[PDB]
Amino acid sequence: RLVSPAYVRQGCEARRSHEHLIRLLLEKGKCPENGWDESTLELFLHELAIMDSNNFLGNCGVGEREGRVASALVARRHYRFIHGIGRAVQPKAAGSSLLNKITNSLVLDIIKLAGVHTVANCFVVPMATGMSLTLCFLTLRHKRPKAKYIIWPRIDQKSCFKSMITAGFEPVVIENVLEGDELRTDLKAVEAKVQELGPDCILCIHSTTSCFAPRVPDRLEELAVICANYDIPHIVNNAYGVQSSKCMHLIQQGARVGRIDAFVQSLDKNFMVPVGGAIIAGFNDSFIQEISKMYPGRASASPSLDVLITLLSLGSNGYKKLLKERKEMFSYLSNQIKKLSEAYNERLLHTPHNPISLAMTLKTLDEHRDKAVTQLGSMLFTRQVSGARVVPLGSMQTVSGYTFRGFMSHTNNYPCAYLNAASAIGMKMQDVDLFIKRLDRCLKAVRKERSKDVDIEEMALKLDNA
Amino acid sequence: RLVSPAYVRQGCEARRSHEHLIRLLLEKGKCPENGWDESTLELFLHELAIMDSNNFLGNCGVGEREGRVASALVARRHYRFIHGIGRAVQPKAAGSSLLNKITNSLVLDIIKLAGVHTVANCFVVPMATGMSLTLCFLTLRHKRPKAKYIIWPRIDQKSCFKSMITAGFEPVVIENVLEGDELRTDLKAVEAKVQELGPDCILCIHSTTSCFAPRVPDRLEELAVICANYDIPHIVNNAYGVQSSKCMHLIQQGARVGRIDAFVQSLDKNFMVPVGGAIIAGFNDSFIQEISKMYPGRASASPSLDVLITLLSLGSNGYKKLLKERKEMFSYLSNQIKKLSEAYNERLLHTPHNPISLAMTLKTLDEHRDKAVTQLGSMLFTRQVSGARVVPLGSMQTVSGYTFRGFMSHTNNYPCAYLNAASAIGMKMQDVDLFIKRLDRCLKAVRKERSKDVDIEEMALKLDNA
Amino acid sequence: RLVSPAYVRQGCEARRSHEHLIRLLLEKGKCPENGWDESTLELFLHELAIMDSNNFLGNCGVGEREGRVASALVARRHYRFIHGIGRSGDISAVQPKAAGSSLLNKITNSLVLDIIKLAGVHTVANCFVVPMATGMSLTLCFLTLRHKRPKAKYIIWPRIDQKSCFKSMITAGFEPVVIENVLEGDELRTDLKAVEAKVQELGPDCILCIHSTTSCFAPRVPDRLEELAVICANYDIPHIVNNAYGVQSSKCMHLIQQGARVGRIDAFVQSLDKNFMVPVGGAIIAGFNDSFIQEISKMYPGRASASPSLDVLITLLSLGSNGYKKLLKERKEMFSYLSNQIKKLSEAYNERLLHTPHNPISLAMTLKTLDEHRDKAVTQLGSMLFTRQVSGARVVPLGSMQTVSGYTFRGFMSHTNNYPCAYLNAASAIGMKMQDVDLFIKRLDRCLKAVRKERS
Amino acid sequence: RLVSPAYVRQGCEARRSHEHLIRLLLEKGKCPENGWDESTLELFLHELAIMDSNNFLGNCGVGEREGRVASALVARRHYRFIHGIGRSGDISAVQPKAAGSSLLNKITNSLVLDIIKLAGVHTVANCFVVPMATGMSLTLCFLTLRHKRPKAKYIIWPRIDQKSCFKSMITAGFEPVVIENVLEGDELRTDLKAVEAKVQELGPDCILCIHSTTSCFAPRVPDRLEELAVICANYDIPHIVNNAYGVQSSKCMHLIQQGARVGRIDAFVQSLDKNFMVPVGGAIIAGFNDSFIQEISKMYPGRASASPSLDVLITLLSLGSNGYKKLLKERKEMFSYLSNQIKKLSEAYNERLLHTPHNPISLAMTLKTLDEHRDKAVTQLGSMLFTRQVSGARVVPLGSMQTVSGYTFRGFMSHTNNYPCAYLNAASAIGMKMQDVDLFIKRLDRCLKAVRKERS
RNA sequence: GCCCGGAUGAUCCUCAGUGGUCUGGGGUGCAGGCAAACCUGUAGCUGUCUAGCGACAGAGUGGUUCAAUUCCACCUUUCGGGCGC
RNA sequence: GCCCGGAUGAUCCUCAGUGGUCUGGGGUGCAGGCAAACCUGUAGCUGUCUAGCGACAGAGUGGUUCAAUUCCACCUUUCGGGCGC
Ligand SMILES: *Cc1c(COP(=O)(O)O)cnc(C)c1O
Ligand SMILES: *Cc1c(COP(=O)(O)O)cnc(C)c1O
Secondary structure: OOOOHHHHHHHHHHHHHHHHHHHHHHHHOOOOOOOOOHHHHHHHHHHHHOOEHHHOOOOEEOOOOOOOOOOHHHHHHOOOOOOOEOOOOOOOEHHHHHHHHHHHHHHHHHHHHHOOOOOOEEEEEOOOHHHHHHHHHHHHHHHOOOOOEEEEEOOOOHHHHHHHHHOOOEEEEEOOEEEOOEEEOOHHHHHHHHHHHOHHHEEEEEEEOOOOOOEOOOOHHHHHHHHHHHOOOEEEEOOOOOOOHHHHHHHHHHHHHOOOOEEEEEHHHHHOOOOOOEEEEEOOHHHHHHHHHHOOOOEOOHHHHHHHHHHHHHHHHHHHHHHHHHHHHHHHHHHHHHHHHHHOOOOEOOOOOOOOEEEEEOOOOOOOOOOHHHHHHHHHHHOOEEOOEEEOOOOEEEEOOEEEEOOOOOOOOOOOOEEEEEOOOOOOHHHHHHHHHHHHHHHHHHHHHHHOOHHHHHHHHHHHHO | OOOOHHHHHHHHHHHHHHHHHHHHHHHHOOOOOOOOOHHHHHHHHHHHHOOEHHHOOOOEEOOOOOOOOOOHHHHHHOOOOOOOEOOOOOOOEHHHHHHHHHHHHHHHHHHHHHOOOOOOEEEEEOOOHHHHHHHHHHHHHHHOOOOOEEEEEOOOOHHHHHHHHHOOOEEEEEOOEEEOOEEEOOHHHHHHHHHHHOHHHEEEEEEEOOOOOOEOOOOHHHHHHHHHHHOOOEEEEOOOOOOOHHHHHHHHHHHHHOOOOEEEEEHHHHHOOOOOOEEEEEOOHHHHHHHHHHOOOOEOOHHHHHHHHHHHHHHHHHHHHHHHHHHHHHHHHHHHHHHHHHHOOOOEOOOOOOOOEEEEEOOOOOOOOOOHHHHHHHHHHHOOEEOOEEEOOOOEEEEOOEEEEOOOOOOOOOOOOEEEEEOOOOOOHHHHHHHHHHHHHHHHHHHHHHHOOHHHHHHHHHHHHO | OOOOHHHHHHHHHHHHHHHHHHHHHHHHOOOOOOOOOHHHHHHHHHHHHOOEHHHOOOOEEOOOOOOOOOOHHHHHHOOOOOOOEOOOOOOOOOOOOEHHHHHHHHHHHHHHHHHHHHHOOOOOOEEEEEOOOHHHHHHHHHHHHHHHOOOOOEEEEEOOOOHHHHHHHHHOOOEEEEEOOEEEOOEEEOOHHHHHHHHHHHOHHHEEEEEEEOOOOOOEOOOOHHHHHHHHHHHOOOEEEEOOOOOOOHHHHHHHHHHHHHOOOOEEEEEHHHHHOOOOOOEEEEEOOHHHHHHHHHHOOOOEOOHHHHHHHHHHHHHHHHHHHHHHHHHHHHHHHHHHHHHHHHHHOOOOEOOOOOOOOEEEEEOOOOOHHHHOHHHHHHHHHHHOOEEOOEEEOOOOEEEEOOEEEEOOOOOOOOOOOOEEEEEOOOOOOHHHHHHHHHHHHHHHHHHHHHHO | OOOOHHHHHHHHHHHHHHHHHHHHHHHHOOOOOOOOOHHHHHHHHHHHHOOEHHHOOOOEEOOOOOOOOOOHHHHHHOOOOOOOEOOOOOOOOOOOOEHHHHHHHHHHHHHHHHHHHHHOOOOOOEEEEEOOOHHHHHHHHHHHHHHHOOOOOEEEEEOOOOHHHHHHHHHOOOEEEEEOOEEEOOEEEOOHHHHHHHHHHHOHHHEEEEEEEOOOOOOEOOOOHHHHHHHHHHHOOOEEEEOOOOOOOHHHHHHHHHHHHHOOOOEEEEEHHHHHOOOOOOEEEEEOOHHHHHHHHHHOOOOEOOHHHHHHHHHHHHHHHHHHHHHHHHHHHHHHHHHHHHHHHHHHOOOOEOOOOOOOOEEEEEOOOOOHHHHOHHHHHHHHHHHOOEEOOEEEOOOOEEEEOOEEEEOOOOOOOOOOOOEEEEEOOOOOOHHHHHHHHHHHHHHHHHHHHHHO
C-alpha cells in the first residue's frame, strides 16, 4: 500500500473542490445558491464533529458532561454531535459552536430572502413556537416589572394562547371584527384596552400573522404604530409565515413604520424538518441577544443540524422553488375547492387577505340532528386525509381557565360551519387531487345517509363503523 | 418469485421471536433485563414510525403541519419520526405518541432501579435541566401567586441559578456551612429565612444533590421536613444524580419523611445521550401531570428516541453494570489522585459525602505571582484533558445581576484553591490513567518554571505558547 | 406502557398497506409499476434478513460458516444479509440456513426477468444474476459449453476492441478466431462470409461457439444476430451474445429477440452496472432454453455474494417499471440531443458526425483536421478532456498497436486495422442528463480551440 | 458565519490526529495495531471515495460506464464506491477514472498480506482479494495453469466431501482424480503412496496440479502438505492448496509455510467470510512466486466488485492486528472448552470423542449408540438440532451416496467409503463465544434424551 | 426454537392445606427445660444508607378484592405432550 | 478541472474619466424647439404589496471611509497565460 506522492496529490486535489464550497459558506455565511451534493455535506459535517472534544482521539474525560454515548446508533444518527449548543478560550464543543453560528447565519439569509430584508439578528432555539414565545415573554418581564397583561387579538390555537399563561401573564383577549367573511384586527378595541389598563401594565401586544381562514394576518402596521406610540413591546407569532411573502412583507412594513420587538416562526412548518425547534428574530440586535441569554443551560443541537442539512441540500434556489410552488398550489387548491363546493351548494369563503389557508362552507350539513359536520371530520380522517380541519358552530372550550365560545372559529358566532384546507410548503398536486376526491366521497355519503381508492375506503368503512 | 406458503410461514415465524420481545415491552413497560439486538430494535422503531400519518402510503395532507421532510438524510436519521411529541380519537402521530409513552415508562423503571422506588410519575421533556427547572417554577406560580422568592442553598452553576431568574423569581441565596473540608446545607439559615420572609412569599425551596466537591448533596431529609411543616414546595436539582445510589436514596428518604414536589435530572449526564433533554419526576402524580400540561405546543421527539434506543440496547442489566463500574472507577480515581497528590505535597480533600466528584488541593501553586492555578487549567486543556475543573481563590462573578464572591467554590472564602475530577457513568480506566499522567506533567512544568504521548505534548506546547 | 387495543389495531392497520405491496410482489414476482416508498422497502428488507439463521435470536453456531460479522458497519451496510446466495452444489438451491437470502435471490431474478421482457426480449425463458461482471460471466458460459463440445477449441468472434470480452475466451481456455469487420459506409459490420468460411475451415465440431456483440462503440454497430443465428442453427454451433449494455436499447433487445426467433441464441449476457445504475460487480445471464440456463447456473462452484442482487432489488423496487421505462425514454431523447449538438459543433471545426444509424447508443465525430504526427493533438485531446472532467469520451487515434494476452491488435480501439480517420466517441447511456451533454459540448469546444491556438 | 482564524486552526488541528493514522497506513501499508475509531475510518473512506471521478463536483459523463447510481440507498451503503476495482485488461491496474477505488484495492491487499504473515505464513510473497468465493477462486487458479500445461487433463485430489472445491476442478474443465484417504487411528489422512502412484500412472505432464486441502471437517485432518510439496517439486507439478478457513489456524498456516520451505506450493486460497467475519463473496489468492500470483490476477477478465475488499478493509482497520490476534487466541481457548464439553457429554451417552489431534478446528463425536435402520435417529438428529436453532452441526450417517457432477461418492460427508461409525461434527471457528458452546451442549443433550425416550 | 398442559420465583428445610392475616406434618440448626428420645422457643436472603449497631425497603412483574401464600394474566425456571432443513 | 493576470455584475446604449454625490465623448428611443442636420429635455430592470395608479425596497456579496461607480477581499461572467490519465 506504499502510495505514490501523486496519489496523495490526487487525494488532496480531490478534496479541494469540496473545501472550496465549505470555505465560501464559512466566509460569507450565505446559503449556497444551488444545493450541495451529499458528499460535500457529509464531509463538512464530519469535519465539524471532529472539532468537538468528545471526538478527539487522545481525549480523556473526568467530568460529568463529557458527551459519552452508549449507543452507536445514537451517535451515528447525530453525526457525532453530542454536546449540544450554548454560550471561550477553552471550548469543549468548538464544532457544535461553529455549527450553531453557521445555522443561524443561514436562517438569517433565508429570512431576508423570504421578505424581511431588514432583519438584524436571529437564532434557532430547540423549542417549538409556543415555548419560544414564552421565552420572549419571560425576557420582557424584567424590562417591565409592573406589567401583567398581554393584549392578544384572538386566534383559536392552544399553544400560542398557553404561551402567555405559562410565562405567568394574563391574556387580554381582543375579539376580532367581521369584515365580509374575514375576521380582522379590532384596532379600536386594542387601543381602547391600552388606555383602559395603562401602557405600563401591558407587557406586550401579541399579534399573529399565519392563521386559519377565515381569520387573516393581523394588521401589523397599525399595531406596530400603536406599540411605538405607547412604548409597548410588540411580539409577533409568525409560526408558519416564513413561507408566505405576504406575511413577511407585513412584518417588514410593520418594523418600518412602527415597532416590532421580535417575531417567532416554527422550524418544522417553514423548513420541512421534524417538530421541535423555532427561530426568534428581530430588528434590535441587543434585545434579540437578551432573549438568547435568558435561556438557562445548554440546548439540543438536533433542530439546528436538521435545518443546516436542509438548507445546504436545498440551497436558496431550492427554497425559492418551494415558495413558488406553494403559491401555485394555493391557486390550484382554491380553484378545485371552488369547483367542488358548487356541486354541493357550498362556497369558498371570501378570504383574499389570507395567503395560506382557505375555508369551504358547510351550511348544507345538519349538525344539530345528524351531527354530520362532526361526522365529516371523522370520515376524512378514516380516509387518511390529514390537516383537513372542520369547524362546527357553537363549540365551547376551556383552555387554562379561560372559556372560549365558538372555539376554532376565532369568534363567538361565525355565520356558518366550514372546512379548512391549506397550501403549505411541500404540498404536491397529488395532495390536492386526493383531498378533493375523498372530500367528494364523504359529502356524498353524508347526503346519501339523509335521503334514506378501494382499500382506503374498505378500511374507512370499518373504522367509521367502529 | 412465486413464493411457497412455507416461505410465508418461515417469514412469519421468524418475526414472531422479535414480536415477542416487543409485546413483553408493551405489556409491562419495563426495561428488558438483557439488551435487545439491533435487528429487534430497528424492527420495533420502523413499526412505530409507520403508525404516524406522514408515513401512511395513501395519505394526503392539506394542513400546515404535515410532517413533510425535504431532506432524506434528515428523515432517515430520525427513523421517520417527524411529528414530535405532545398531548384522541383522531391521532395524527399515533406512533410518536406510543414512543413517548414507552419511553416514559422505561425511564420510570430505571428511576426505581436507581434508588427512588416510590416515584409515582415522570416524563421526558426535550429541554435541558435548567429550562426544565424553570418549567417547574412556572407551574408553581399559579399555585402560589403571592410568592416571589426561591430559597436556594448556594451551588456555583450558572444554569440552575438562571433557571429561577428566567422563571421570573428572586433567588434567596443561602450560604453553605463549612464542616471539615465539606460545604453543607445551612439548615438554620434556611429556616430563619422562611420565617423572615414568610412561607406564603416563598415559591419553593430549590435544593441540589449532584454537585462538585467540596460541596456535597443537600440535606434533603431535613429540607423536606421544613417544606412539609411550612407547606412550601420542594424542587430538587438532581442533574446527574440518577447514576448515584447515594443521591437517589436521599431523594427517596426525603419524600418518605417530608415533602419533595419534583426532582429533575439530565438525560445526557445520566444516560449517555446527546445534550438536550431531561426528566421531571415526582411523587404526586397529579402535580407531575400539571407540570406536563404547562408546556405549550408540541415538542421534539429526538431526546426520547435517544434514551429509548439506549435503554432497549443496554437493558436494565447493562445500566446496572454501568452503575457498578462508576463506583469502582470512583475508588480507583480517588486512590490515584491520593497517590499523585502526595508527590506534590497536595492532598485529596476529605469529602466522603460526595459520591461522584473529588477535589485535590492546589496550595503549592502560586496564583498571585505566577498565575499557575490558571495556567494549570489551560495546560490540562491543551493536553486534551476535559472536565478537569480548576477553582482558584477569590473569583468574583456576576450572573444576571447577582454578584458571587469566591465563584466556582460555592462559598466566599474556601481555605484553598483546588482541582476537580469526577467519576461519571461511562468513564474507563484509560480516562483515569491518562488524566493522572497528564496532570503529573502539568505539575512538573509549573514547578520547573519556578525553579528557573509525544504528539499531544507537541501540540500542547504550541497552544500554550500561542 | 399501556398499549390499548387501539395501538395493537392501529399497528396492524398501518402494516397492512405496506404488506399489501409486499404480498403483491411475492405472489407474482413482477416489478411494481410505481416505485415503493423507502419505508416499505426497508421494512421488506428487514423482514427478509430476520429469516436468515445468523439473525435468529436464540441461535448458537458451532460451524465454520456461521455468518458472524465483526464490524457493525459491515453488517448494517448489507442490511444484515451475510450468508450470500446459493449452496455448495447450486447457487439456485434454497439454503435452510439462509431462507431470507434465498428468497431475495429468487425475487431479484424474477424482477430482472420482468425487466428483460419489458426492455424488448419478450420471449426470454430464464435468467439469473451472477455476482461477476460481464467478462467473467461470458467465461462461465464458455466453461459450461466445454463439456458439451469436448473437441471444441475455437471461439469465432467478430472483432470488437474491448479487453474484457476478448480475455473472457482466453481465460475460459479457448482460442479466439478474430473475424475482421466490413466497412459499409462509415459503419463497421459483421463479415458474414468470413464467419461462415471459418466455420467450414476449422470445422463446426472444433468451434465451441460463435461469440457476437450487440452494444458497442461507434462506428461499430451491433452484430448481424439474425444471420449469425441462422449460421449457428444450420451447423449446430452454440451462439453466445455479449449484450454488455444493450438492455437499455430496445433496438438491441429486439435484435436479440429476432435472432432467437429465426435461428439459435444459447445465451446473452449483460452488465448490471451499465444497465441498472448500480455499482460494478454483477451481470445477468439469460436465454431461451430454460434447462441450459440452469446448467450455467449449476456450473458455478460454491456460494456467491448477495451484494449485486441486493443492489438491483433495491433499485428496481425503488424505480418501478414506470421509472425504468422513463429512463429508457429519456435515453433516446438524450441520444437525439447529443447527436444534434455534436453535428452543430462538428460544423464549426470542419469535422462531421460519422453516419452510424445502426448504433443506437454510441456516436463518433471525426478528428481528421487534427494533426497527430505534427502536433500529437489527437493523443493530447484525450488527456485534455480528462483534465476538464469529461469522462467517457474515447479518442480513437490511427494505427494504434496493442497486445492483449499475446494477440496483437492493429488499429486498436477502432475495431479494424485501418479505419479511414481518427475520431471521438460519445454515448447516450441511461441516467444521462441534458447538463452532461451541454458541459461536454462546452468543454470539447474549449479543447479544440486550445489545440488550434497552440499550433498557430 | 465568522470563522475566526481560531476555527480554521482548530479544524486543522482536529484533522491532524486522524490524518496521522491515515498517513501511517499509506506509508507502510501495515494493519494498525489497535483498531481505528469509527470517525477516523469513515473520514478515510469518504476521502477515498471523493477521488473517484463519478464523485467529482464538475463531472460530466458521456460514456456507458459512468458509475451513475439511481438509488441513494445503494450509493450510501457502498460509501459511494461505484466503479469497482481494476481495469478492462487487469484488475490490479490503476484506474484514472477511479483513483480512490484503486487505492482502496491496494491498501486492502496490503492489509491482507500483513494478516497472512501474522497468521503464520511469514514467507508469503504476494496476495490479492478477488470478489469470488473460494471454489470459484480455485477455478481461476486452474484456469491460469491451463496455458502453462496444455497437455494436462487431470487434477490429483485427496478426497474431501465438500461440493464447491470438488466442482471447482470440473468447472475449470479438468477431470478430478479422487485419492481415497487412509484410516490412521480415528483420523483420515493423505495416502501419499496412492498420490505418487497416480502421478506415475497418468504421467506428470498430464496432471494440471495436485489439489490439497488444509482446513476440513474432522475426522479428516489437513493434508500432508510437506510430503505433497516434495512430490510436486520432484515431478515439476503445480501444487494448489485449498485453505478455505485455515487462516484462523496457526497450525494450518505453519503447515503451509513448511510445505513451501521444503517443496513446492504454487498458490493457496482462503475464504474472506470464514476467516474475517464478513459476508460471503470474496476470497484471497496467495503464493510465494510473485510473478505467478500476478498471472492469476491478470487472468481475471474485466472489472470486479469492490464490496468484499471494502468489507475486509473496514474490518481489519476496526479490529487492528491486536484485535485479530485476540480472536485467534480466543478460538484456541474455545476449541479446548468445546472439546472438554463434548468429552463430558459423550460420556453420559456411552459415546466418545474421536481422537483427531491433527485437526485444530473441527471435532467429531461418535453416534454409534443411535440406531438409524431401526429408528432413523441419526438422520433425525440433524433436523432436531436445526429446529432447536443449532447451526453448523454436521450429522454424518453411514453409507450415504451422493452424485456430484456425474461422480458418485459413497459414504458421502465422511470423506471415505466406510468410516467405522456415524458421528457428529462441531467446530471452534473465529468469533465463537462461550455461550455458543453452552447452548449447543444443552440443546444436544436434550436431543439425545428425546431420541432415547422415543425408542423406549 | 415454537405450540400446548402443569407445576415454579424471595421468609431454616421440606410436604400438605388454606382468600381472613397463614396453618401443621415431618425434618435441620441454634437455644433452654426434663443421651437416644423428648418438651418449649427461635431461624433466612437481597438492595440502599451507616465506622458501627442498626435504619429504610423488597417476596417474579402486574391485576382483582376491605383482605391474595391462596384467585387472574404475563414472565423466570422446570417437568410433560407435540412439531423435525 | 485547478493555478495565475486582467477585466466583469443591476440606472437607454456604449466609450473614457473620477473617492466628494458622478462626469462627458459618441450614439438610440421618446418628447418638444428651430429633413439631413441641429438645440433642449427625458429614459431602464427585479422582488414585494396593491383592482389600480402607485407604495416599500434592491445595484454581485461584504469591507474601509464623514463620503465608494471610484479603494480592498471574495463571488458571477468572461478574456488571457499555464498544467494534460
Ligand atoms: C468454504 C469451503 C470451500 C469453499 O466454499 P465456497 O462457497 O465456494 O466459498 C471449499 N472447501 C472447503 C473445505 C470449505 O470449507
Ligand atoms: C462492459 C463491457 C464488457 C464487460 O466488461 P466488464 O468489466 O467485465 O464488466 C464487455 N464488452 C463490452 C463491449 C463492454 O462494454
